[PDB]
Ligand binder design. Structure first.
Ligand SMILES: O=c1[nH]cnc2c1ncn2[C@@H]1O[C@H](COP(=O)(O)OP(=O)(O)O)[C@@H](O)[C@H]1O
Length: 223
């Protein structure tokens, strides 16, 4: 009769944990399609929005993890506008699409600490963002990361375009201290939020051993 499907839209800069968190969630929930802008050729005729809608055509798909930074408000505007315009090419009128913002940069986080956490993650642990995956020029890494931060516009659901989100999940971002890693905390935040608010997506919280193992795999993942 009627189906609701979801597009999880991150708002992040480089090294905030976006790919790690989405890889963890896909490890846990293989039916949640993880579409990585970083892996799409720029001559490809199917761009991330096209692949998103193709994925949502499948009856077995309920969630697309839309893996792109979307640090600028114009980038969020593009998702809403393009998906809204193109969905009729792909989906019948019994499918309701909901957009879930996954906010990776807390309002309370200073730009200095955003830089401190993310730049040192990228240099110490690596990042597969294509323009910086080599890191043969640490000046280039700094310059690209600064570009995303310069363009970053915090989520604001009291105005266009972010008022089009149906739900926002607020993540944490902090320096690693002892065994604590904010990306694993954030996986749990997402799972708990969906268990409570979207039981159609997670009827029962997975065992903690499995959540932690899926996170370990994502943390260790090299492509
Ligand atoms: O909570 C964390 N603590 C420490 N390092 C992390 C955490 N989450 C991800 N990382 C590491 O940070 C680096 C950047 O990962 P991220 O998921 O931010 O990539 P992204 O820029 O493609 O979204 C990776 O080497 C990853 O393993």
């Amino acid at each position: 009769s009627t189906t609701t499907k979801y597009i999880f839209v991150p708002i992040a800069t480089i090294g905030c944990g976006k790919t790690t968190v989405f890889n963890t969630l896909n490890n846990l929930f293989p039916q949640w399609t993880h579409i990585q802008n970083n892996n799409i050729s720029k001559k490809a005729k199917l761009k991330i929005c096209d692949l998103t809608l193709l994925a949502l055509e499948d009856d077995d798909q309920s969630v697309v993890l839309f893996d792109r930074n979307n640090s600028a408000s114009r980038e969020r505007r593009q998702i809403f506008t393009t998906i809204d315009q193109k969905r009729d090419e792909h989906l019948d009128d019994t499918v309701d699409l909901k957009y879930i913002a996954i906010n990776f940069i807390p309002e309370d986080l200073s730009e200095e600490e955003l830089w401190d956490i993310t730049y040192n993650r990228v240099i110490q642990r690596g990042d597969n963002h294509q323009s910086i995956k080599s890191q043969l020029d640490e000046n280039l890494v700094e310059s690209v990361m600064k570009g995303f931060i310069q363009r970053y516009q915090p989520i604001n659901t009291s105005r266009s375009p972010d008022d089009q989100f149906d739900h926002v999940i607020h993540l944490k971002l902090s320096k690693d201290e002892n065994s604590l890693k904010s990306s694993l905390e954030n996986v749990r935040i997402i799972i708990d939020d969906l268990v409570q608010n979207f039981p159609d997506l997670i009827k029962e919280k997975p065992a903690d051993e499995l959540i932690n193992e899926c996170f370990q795999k994502a943390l260790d993942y090299k492509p």
